[PDB]
Design a protein around this ligand. Structure first.
Ligand SMILES: CC(=O)N[C@@H]1[C@@H](O[C@@H]2O[C@H](CO)[C@H](O)[C@H](O)[C@H]2O)[C@@H](O)[C@@H](CO)O[C@@H]1O
Ligand code: NA
Length: 405
Protein backbone atom coordinates (compact mmCIF):
# COMPACT_ATOMS: atom_id res chain seq x y z
CA UNK A 1 0.00 0.00 0.00
CA UNK A 2 3.02 2.29 0.54
CA UNK A 3 5.74 2.35 -2.14
CA UNK A 4 9.47 2.36 -1.31
CA UNK A 5 12.06 2.88 -4.08
CA UNK A 6 15.32 0.89 -3.68
CA UNK A 7 18.25 1.21 -6.10
CA UNK A 8 20.98 -1.41 -5.64
CA UNK A 9 24.37 -1.80 -7.32
CA UNK A 10 24.73 -5.01 -9.34
CA UNK A 11 28.20 -6.23 -8.44
CA UNK A 12 30.03 -9.53 -8.40
CA UNK A 13 27.66 -11.10 -5.85
CA UNK A 14 24.82 -10.65 -8.36
CA UNK A 15 21.49 -8.81 -8.53
CA UNK A 16 19.16 -11.76 -7.81
CA UNK A 17 19.92 -11.66 -4.07
CA UNK A 18 18.36 -8.18 -3.87
CA UNK A 19 15.26 -9.39 -5.68
CA UNK A 20 14.97 -12.23 -3.16
CA UNK A 21 15.57 -10.01 -0.10
CA UNK A 22 12.92 -7.58 -1.35
CA UNK A 23 10.41 -10.38 -1.82
CA UNK A 24 11.13 -11.70 1.67
CA UNK A 25 10.61 -8.25 3.20
CA UNK A 26 7.27 -7.87 1.39
CA UNK A 27 6.15 -11.26 2.70
CA UNK A 28 6.96 -10.11 6.24
CA UNK A 29 5.35 -6.67 5.75
CA UNK A 30 2.71 -6.93 3.00
CA UNK A 31 1.74 -3.25 3.33
CA UNK A 32 5.15 -2.27 1.84
CA UNK A 33 5.65 -2.41 -1.94
CA UNK A 34 9.30 -2.05 -2.96
CA UNK A 35 10.21 -0.89 -6.46
CA UNK A 36 13.67 -2.40 -6.93
CA UNK A 37 16.14 -1.22 -9.55
CA UNK A 38 19.42 -3.15 -9.87
CA UNK A 39 22.10 -1.94 -12.28
CA UNK A 40 25.80 -1.51 -12.86
CA UNK A 41 25.01 2.16 -13.60
CA UNK A 42 23.29 3.33 -10.40
CA UNK A 43 24.31 6.96 -11.03
CA UNK A 44 21.42 7.12 -13.53
CA UNK A 45 18.91 7.00 -10.66
CA UNK A 46 20.34 9.89 -8.61
CA UNK A 47 21.14 12.92 -10.78
CA UNK A 48 22.35 16.36 -9.63
CA UNK A 49 19.48 18.61 -8.59
CA UNK A 50 16.83 15.95 -9.12
CA UNK A 51 13.30 16.45 -7.83
CA UNK A 52 12.73 15.02 -4.35
CA UNK A 53 9.75 12.94 -5.49
CA UNK A 54 12.03 11.11 -7.94
CA UNK A 55 14.96 10.18 -5.67
CA UNK A 56 15.29 6.58 -4.52
CA UNK A 57 14.36 6.16 -0.88
CA UNK A 58 17.35 3.89 -0.23
CA UNK A 59 20.48 3.10 -2.26
CA UNK A 60 23.09 0.34 -2.05
CA UNK A 61 26.33 1.76 -3.47
CA UNK A 62 29.70 1.67 -1.75
CA UNK A 63 32.38 4.26 -1.61
CA UNK A 64 34.85 3.64 -4.41
CA UNK A 65 32.27 2.89 -7.07
CA UNK A 66 32.87 3.70 -10.74
CA UNK A 67 30.75 6.87 -10.66
CA UNK A 68 31.94 8.19 -7.31
CA UNK A 69 28.32 9.03 -6.50
CA UNK A 70 28.45 8.15 -2.80
CA UNK A 71 31.43 10.47 -2.27
CA UNK A 72 29.78 13.21 -4.34
CA UNK A 73 26.67 13.12 -2.17
CA UNK A 74 28.75 13.07 1.04
CA UNK A 75 30.60 16.17 -0.21
CA UNK A 76 27.22 17.82 -0.90
CA UNK A 77 25.87 16.87 2.56
CA UNK A 78 23.10 15.04 0.70
CA UNK A 79 22.98 11.73 2.64
CA UNK A 80 20.71 11.26 5.66
CA UNK A 81 22.15 10.63 9.12
CA UNK A 82 20.98 7.08 9.86
CA UNK A 83 22.54 6.65 13.32
CA UNK A 84 19.04 5.96 14.62
CA UNK A 85 18.91 2.75 12.56
CA UNK A 86 21.50 1.22 14.88
CA UNK A 87 18.99 1.30 17.75
CA UNK A 88 16.02 0.06 15.68
CA UNK A 89 14.58 -3.41 16.13
CA UNK A 90 15.34 -5.74 13.23
CA UNK A 91 12.00 -6.55 11.52
CA UNK A 92 10.96 -10.11 12.31
CA UNK A 93 13.49 -10.43 15.18
CA UNK A 94 13.83 -9.39 18.83
CA UNK A 95 17.26 -7.71 18.57
CA UNK A 96 18.39 -4.28 17.43
CA UNK A 97 20.75 -3.71 14.52
CA UNK A 98 23.56 -2.68 16.89
CA UNK A 99 23.00 -5.89 18.90
CA UNK A 100 23.82 -7.88 15.74
CA UNK A 101 26.65 -5.95 14.08
CA UNK A 102 30.16 -7.33 14.45
CA UNK A 103 32.36 -5.32 16.79
CA UNK A 104 34.25 -2.44 15.26
CA UNK A 105 32.51 -2.35 11.86
CA UNK A 106 31.23 1.17 12.59
CA UNK A 107 34.16 3.48 11.93
CA UNK A 108 35.69 5.88 9.43
CA UNK A 109 33.99 4.21 6.44
CA UNK A 110 30.48 4.29 7.90
CA UNK A 111 30.96 7.62 9.72
CA UNK A 112 32.73 9.59 6.98
CA UNK A 113 32.67 12.96 8.76
CA UNK A 114 34.27 11.53 11.89
CA UNK A 115 32.47 11.39 15.17
CA UNK A 116 29.53 9.21 16.06
CA UNK A 117 27.08 9.95 13.20
CA UNK A 118 26.60 7.04 10.79
CA UNK A 119 25.72 7.88 7.17
CA UNK A 120 26.76 4.68 5.33
CA UNK A 121 25.41 1.54 6.93
CA UNK A 122 27.77 -1.38 6.23
CA UNK A 123 27.06 -4.01 3.60
CA UNK A 124 28.99 -7.27 3.12
CA UNK A 125 32.16 -8.26 4.98
CA UNK A 126 34.83 -9.35 2.51
CA UNK A 127 38.52 -9.86 3.22
CA UNK A 128 40.55 -8.23 0.46
CA UNK A 129 44.15 -9.01 -0.43
CA UNK A 130 45.72 -10.81 -3.42
CA UNK A 131 44.00 -13.61 -5.36
CA UNK A 132 45.76 -16.14 -7.56
CA UNK A 133 45.58 -19.69 -8.95
CA UNK A 134 46.87 -21.83 -6.07
CA UNK A 135 47.45 -24.72 -8.50
CA UNK A 136 49.75 -22.67 -10.73
CA UNK A 137 51.97 -21.70 -7.81
CA UNK A 138 52.09 -25.32 -6.63
CA UNK A 139 52.99 -26.65 -10.09
CA UNK A 140 56.06 -24.39 -10.19
CA UNK A 141 57.09 -24.82 -6.55
CA UNK A 142 56.45 -21.12 -5.92
CA UNK A 143 55.63 -20.21 -2.32
CA UNK A 144 53.27 -17.32 -1.65
CA UNK A 145 55.49 -14.30 -0.81
CA UNK A 146 55.19 -12.52 2.51
CA UNK A 147 57.51 -9.67 1.43
CA UNK A 148 57.79 -7.46 -1.63
CA UNK A 149 61.42 -8.51 -2.15
CA UNK A 150 60.10 -12.08 -2.53
CA UNK A 151 57.28 -10.83 -4.78
CA UNK A 152 59.68 -9.12 -7.17
CA UNK A 153 61.99 -12.15 -7.31
CA UNK A 154 58.93 -14.29 -8.05
CA UNK A 155 57.99 -11.85 -10.81
CA UNK A 156 61.46 -12.35 -12.29
CA UNK A 157 60.96 -16.15 -12.29
CA UNK A 158 57.41 -15.92 -13.64
CA UNK A 159 58.43 -13.75 -16.60
CA UNK A 160 60.82 -16.46 -17.73
CA UNK A 161 57.72 -18.66 -18.09
CA UNK A 162 55.66 -16.08 -19.98
CA UNK A 163 53.63 -14.93 -16.94
CA UNK A 164 53.27 -11.38 -15.66
CA UNK A 165 53.41 -10.96 -11.89
CA UNK A 166 50.50 -8.58 -11.44
CA UNK A 167 47.30 -7.18 -12.91
CA UNK A 168 44.39 -5.30 -11.41
CA UNK A 169 40.72 -5.00 -12.41
CA UNK A 170 40.45 -1.22 -12.17
CA UNK A 171 42.62 1.28 -10.35
CA UNK A 172 39.89 1.74 -7.75
CA UNK A 173 40.82 -1.66 -6.34
CA UNK A 174 43.90 0.00 -4.88
CA UNK A 175 41.61 1.17 -2.07
CA UNK A 176 41.99 -2.13 -0.19
CA UNK A 177 45.56 -2.63 -1.41
CA UNK A 178 46.74 0.69 0.06
CA UNK A 179 44.77 0.28 3.30
CA UNK A 180 46.77 -2.91 3.89
CA UNK A 181 50.12 -1.65 2.57
CA UNK A 182 50.00 1.60 4.56
CA UNK A 183 49.17 -0.25 7.80
CA UNK A 184 51.90 -2.81 7.00
CA UNK A 185 54.61 -0.18 6.64
CA UNK A 186 53.61 2.40 9.22
CA UNK A 187 51.21 0.82 11.71
CA UNK A 188 47.69 1.64 12.85
CA UNK A 189 48.18 5.30 13.75
CA UNK A 190 50.02 6.01 10.50
CA UNK A 191 47.08 4.57 8.56
CA UNK A 192 44.66 6.76 10.54
CA UNK A 193 46.95 9.74 9.87
CA UNK A 194 46.76 9.16 6.11
CA UNK A 195 42.97 8.80 6.13
CA UNK A 196 42.57 12.04 8.14
CA UNK A 197 45.10 14.23 6.27
CA UNK A 198 47.75 14.67 8.97
CA UNK A 199 50.05 17.50 7.92
CA UNK A 200 52.92 16.37 5.67
CA UNK A 201 52.02 12.68 6.05
CA UNK A 202 52.82 11.89 2.41
CA UNK A 203 56.39 13.17 2.91
CA UNK A 204 57.09 10.59 5.63
CA UNK A 205 59.48 7.73 4.90
CA UNK A 206 56.57 5.35 5.50
CA UNK A 207 54.38 6.95 2.83
CA UNK A 208 57.26 7.20 0.36
CA UNK A 209 58.00 3.49 0.84
CA UNK A 210 54.38 2.56 0.08
CA UNK A 211 54.50 4.55 -3.16
CA UNK A 212 57.97 3.37 -4.20
CA UNK A 213 56.92 -0.27 -3.76
CA UNK A 214 53.72 0.18 -5.75
CA UNK A 215 55.56 2.18 -8.43
CA UNK A 216 57.99 -0.69 -9.03
CA UNK A 217 55.14 -3.21 -9.09
CA UNK A 218 53.07 -1.39 -11.72
CA UNK A 219 55.96 -0.19 -13.94
CA UNK A 220 58.14 -3.35 -14.03
CA UNK A 221 55.79 -6.24 -13.20
CA UNK A 222 52.39 -5.42 -14.75
CA UNK A 223 50.56 -7.40 -17.43
CA UNK A 224 50.74 -5.15 -20.53
CA UNK A 225 46.97 -5.47 -21.12
CA UNK A 226 46.05 -4.10 -17.69
CA UNK A 227 45.72 -0.35 -18.25
CA UNK A 228 43.73 -0.73 -21.47
CA UNK A 229 41.20 -3.02 -19.76
CA UNK A 230 41.13 -1.16 -16.39
CA UNK A 231 37.64 0.29 -16.81
CA UNK A 232 34.02 -0.52 -16.07
CA UNK A 233 33.55 -2.30 -19.40
CA UNK A 234 36.67 -4.48 -19.47
CA UNK A 235 37.76 -5.07 -15.87
CA UNK A 236 36.73 -8.71 -16.01
CA UNK A 237 39.23 -9.24 -18.85
CA UNK A 238 42.02 -8.31 -16.45
CA UNK A 239 40.53 -10.79 -13.99
CA UNK A 240 40.37 -13.37 -16.78
CA UNK A 241 44.16 -13.18 -17.12
CA UNK A 242 44.43 -14.90 -13.72
CA UNK A 243 42.11 -17.69 -14.85
CA UNK A 244 44.04 -18.01 -18.14
CA UNK A 245 47.45 -18.20 -16.44
CA UNK A 246 48.86 -14.97 -17.93
CA UNK A 247 49.07 -12.99 -14.64
CA UNK A 248 49.92 -14.37 -11.19
CA UNK A 249 48.20 -11.97 -8.75
CA UNK A 250 45.55 -9.26 -8.59
CA UNK A 251 44.00 -7.29 -5.69
CA UNK A 252 40.48 -8.49 -4.99
CA UNK A 253 37.84 -9.73 -2.56
CA UNK A 254 35.42 -12.62 -2.12
CA UNK A 255 32.91 -11.58 -4.82
CA UNK A 256 35.52 -12.74 -7.36
CA UNK A 257 34.36 -16.35 -7.05
CA UNK A 258 30.75 -15.72 -8.02
CA UNK A 259 31.69 -13.00 -10.51
CA UNK A 260 33.94 -15.32 -12.52
CA UNK A 261 32.03 -18.59 -12.01
CA UNK A 262 31.01 -19.01 -15.66
CA UNK A 263 34.39 -18.05 -17.16
CA UNK A 264 36.80 -20.59 -18.67
CA UNK A 265 39.93 -21.35 -16.70
CA UNK A 266 43.06 -23.46 -16.90
CA UNK A 267 42.88 -27.14 -16.03
CA UNK A 268 42.86 -27.66 -12.28
CA UNK A 269 42.46 -23.97 -11.39
CA UNK A 270 41.78 -23.34 -7.71
CA UNK A 271 41.36 -19.97 -6.00
CA UNK A 272 44.15 -18.88 -3.69
CA UNK A 273 44.04 -15.87 -1.36
CA UNK A 274 46.75 -14.10 0.64
CA UNK A 275 47.29 -10.79 2.44
CA UNK A 276 49.20 -8.16 0.50
CA UNK A 277 52.92 -8.69 1.29
CA UNK A 278 54.73 -6.34 3.63
CA UNK A 279 58.23 -4.86 3.25
CA UNK A 280 60.21 -6.16 6.24
CA UNK A 281 60.75 -9.88 6.72
CA UNK A 282 58.53 -11.22 9.50
CA UNK A 283 56.45 -8.04 9.61
CA UNK A 284 52.76 -7.88 10.39
CA UNK A 285 50.56 -8.19 7.31
CA UNK A 286 47.08 -6.70 7.14
CA UNK A 287 43.92 -7.96 5.44
CA UNK A 288 41.43 -5.25 4.51
CA UNK A 289 37.85 -5.87 5.61
CA UNK A 290 35.98 -4.50 2.61
CA UNK A 291 32.40 -3.31 3.05
CA UNK A 292 29.99 -1.57 0.73
CA UNK A 293 27.26 0.79 1.91
CA UNK A 294 23.51 1.23 2.09
CA UNK A 295 22.19 4.74 2.65
CA UNK A 296 19.21 7.07 2.42
CA UNK A 297 19.35 10.26 0.31
CA UNK A 298 18.53 13.41 2.24
CA UNK A 299 15.89 14.12 -0.44
CA UNK A 300 14.18 10.72 -0.06
CA UNK A 301 10.40 10.89 0.26
CA UNK A 302 9.88 7.85 2.56
CA UNK A 303 12.76 7.86 5.04
CA UNK A 304 11.04 6.01 7.88
CA UNK A 305 9.94 3.10 5.70
CA UNK A 306 13.44 3.01 4.23
CA UNK A 307 15.01 2.83 7.71
CA UNK A 308 12.91 -0.23 8.63
CA UNK A 309 13.88 -1.98 5.40
CA UNK A 310 17.52 -1.05 6.04
CA UNK A 311 17.29 -2.68 9.47
CA UNK A 312 15.95 -5.83 7.81
CA UNK A 313 19.17 -6.09 5.78
CA UNK A 314 20.76 -7.28 9.06
CA UNK A 315 18.18 -10.01 9.65
CA UNK A 316 19.11 -13.68 9.60
CA UNK A 317 16.65 -14.15 6.74
CA UNK A 318 18.43 -11.55 4.63
CA UNK A 319 21.87 -12.84 5.62
CA UNK A 320 20.97 -16.34 4.42
CA UNK A 321 19.88 -14.99 1.01
CA UNK A 322 22.99 -12.84 0.56
CA UNK A 323 25.31 -15.70 1.57
CA UNK A 324 24.33 -17.93 -1.38
CA UNK A 325 26.78 -16.03 -3.67
CA UNK A 326 29.34 -15.18 -0.95
CA UNK A 327 27.92 -11.86 0.28
CA UNK A 328 28.40 -12.06 4.06
CA UNK A 329 26.53 -9.46 6.06
CA UNK A 330 28.60 -7.97 8.91
CA UNK A 331 26.66 -9.59 11.74
CA UNK A 332 27.80 -11.83 14.58
CA UNK A 333 28.05 -15.52 13.76
CA UNK A 334 27.91 -15.04 10.00
CA UNK A 335 31.40 -16.56 9.50
CA UNK A 336 30.59 -19.67 11.51
CA UNK A 337 29.74 -22.50 9.08
CA UNK A 338 31.06 -20.60 6.05
CA UNK A 339 30.43 -22.06 2.62
CA UNK A 340 33.40 -24.14 1.51
CA UNK A 341 34.30 -21.79 -1.34
CA UNK A 342 34.86 -18.98 1.20
CA UNK A 343 37.23 -20.94 3.45
CA UNK A 344 40.39 -20.00 1.52
CA UNK A 345 39.54 -16.31 1.96
CA UNK A 346 38.61 -16.28 5.65
CA UNK A 347 41.41 -18.69 6.61
CA UNK A 348 43.90 -15.93 5.80
CA UNK A 349 42.87 -14.18 9.03
CA UNK A 350 44.36 -17.18 10.89
CA UNK A 351 47.89 -16.83 9.48
CA UNK A 352 50.52 -15.91 12.05
CA UNK A 353 51.06 -12.18 12.56
CA UNK A 354 48.12 -11.07 10.39
CA UNK A 355 45.72 -8.31 11.44
CA UNK A 356 42.68 -6.55 9.99
CA UNK A 357 42.40 -2.98 8.67
CA UNK A 358 39.35 -1.12 7.35
CA UNK A 359 38.23 2.35 6.38
CA UNK A 360 38.33 5.12 3.79
CA UNK A 361 39.26 8.79 3.66
CA UNK A 362 37.60 11.39 5.86
CA UNK A 363 34.85 13.37 4.10
CA UNK A 364 34.91 16.30 6.56
CA UNK A 365 36.81 18.67 4.27
CA UNK A 366 36.51 19.29 0.54
CA UNK A 367 38.68 21.39 -1.77
CA UNK A 368 37.64 22.67 -5.19
CA UNK A 369 39.17 20.64 -8.00
CA UNK A 370 40.96 18.12 -5.77
CA UNK A 371 40.11 14.47 -5.08
CA UNK A 372 42.50 12.46 -2.90
CA UNK A 373 41.13 9.19 -4.32
CA UNK A 374 42.01 10.28 -7.85
CA UNK A 375 45.48 11.21 -6.60
CA UNK A 376 46.13 7.89 -4.83
CA UNK A 377 44.15 5.26 -6.75
CA UNK A 378 43.31 6.55 -10.22
CA UNK A 379 46.87 7.88 -10.59
CA UNK A 380 48.12 4.27 -10.70
CA UNK A 381 46.97 4.09 -14.34
CA UNK A 382 49.09 7.14 -15.25
CA UNK A 383 52.06 5.81 -13.24
CA UNK A 384 51.83 2.46 -15.03
CA UNK A 385 51.64 4.28 -18.38
CA UNK A 386 54.80 6.30 -17.67
CA UNK A 387 52.99 9.63 -17.46
CA UNK A 388 53.47 10.26 -13.73
CA UNK A 389 56.81 9.91 -12.00
CA UNK A 390 57.17 8.60 -8.46
CA UNK A 391 58.04 12.13 -7.31
CA UNK A 392 55.03 13.63 -9.08
CA UNK A 393 52.76 11.02 -7.45
CA UNK A 394 54.01 11.84 -3.96
CA UNK A 395 54.03 15.61 -4.52
CA UNK A 396 50.43 15.68 -5.76
CA UNK A 397 49.26 13.58 -2.80
CA UNK A 398 51.03 15.82 -0.29
CA UNK A 399 49.58 18.93 -1.93
CA UNK A 400 46.01 17.61 -1.94
CA UNK A 401 46.22 16.08 1.54
CA UNK A 402 47.65 19.31 2.99
CA UNK A 403 44.91 21.37 1.32
CA UNK A 404 42.25 19.07 2.82
CA UNK A 405 43.96 19.46 6.21
C1 LIG B 1 34.36 -2.52 -11.58
C2 LIG B 1 33.28 -2.80 -10.57
O1 LIG B 1 32.23 -2.17 -10.58
N1 LIG B 1 33.54 -3.77 -9.67
C3 LIG B 1 32.61 -4.13 -8.61
C4 LIG B 1 33.31 -3.90 -7.27
O2 LIG B 1 33.53 -2.53 -7.12
C5 LIG B 1 34.92 -2.21 -6.92
O3 LIG B 1 35.25 -2.51 -5.59
C6 LIG B 1 36.63 -2.33 -5.32
C7 LIG B 1 36.89 -2.88 -3.93
O4 LIG B 1 38.28 -2.98 -3.71
C8 LIG B 1 36.98 -0.86 -5.47
O5 LIG B 1 36.24 -0.09 -4.54
C9 LIG B 1 36.61 -0.45 -6.88
O6 LIG B 1 36.87 0.91 -7.15
C10 LIG B 1 35.14 -0.72 -7.20
O7 LIG B 1 34.82 -0.44 -8.56
C11 LIG B 1 32.43 -4.39 -6.13
O8 LIG B 1 31.32 -3.52 -6.06
C12 LIG B 1 31.99 -5.84 -6.38
C13 LIG B 1 31.11 -6.52 -5.33
O9 LIG B 1 29.87 -5.88 -5.24
O10 LIG B 1 31.33 -5.97 -7.63
C14 LIG B 1 32.10 -5.57 -8.74
O11 LIG B 1 33.19 -6.44 -8.89
NA1 NA C 1 27.80 -18.84 8.28
Amino acid sequence: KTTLKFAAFEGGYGADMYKEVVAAYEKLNPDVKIELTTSKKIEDEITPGMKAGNYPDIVELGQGSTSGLTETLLKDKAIEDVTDVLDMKVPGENKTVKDKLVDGVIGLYTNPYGGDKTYLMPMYYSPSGLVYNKTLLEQNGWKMPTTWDEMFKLGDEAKAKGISLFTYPTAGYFDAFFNALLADIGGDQFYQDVMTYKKDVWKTDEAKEALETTYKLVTEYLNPDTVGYANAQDFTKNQQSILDGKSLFMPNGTWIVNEMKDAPRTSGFEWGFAPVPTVKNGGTRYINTTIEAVWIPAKAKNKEAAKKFMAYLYSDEAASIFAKTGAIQPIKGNTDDLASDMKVFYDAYNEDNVKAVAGSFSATATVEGKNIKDDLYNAVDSVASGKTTLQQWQDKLNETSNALN
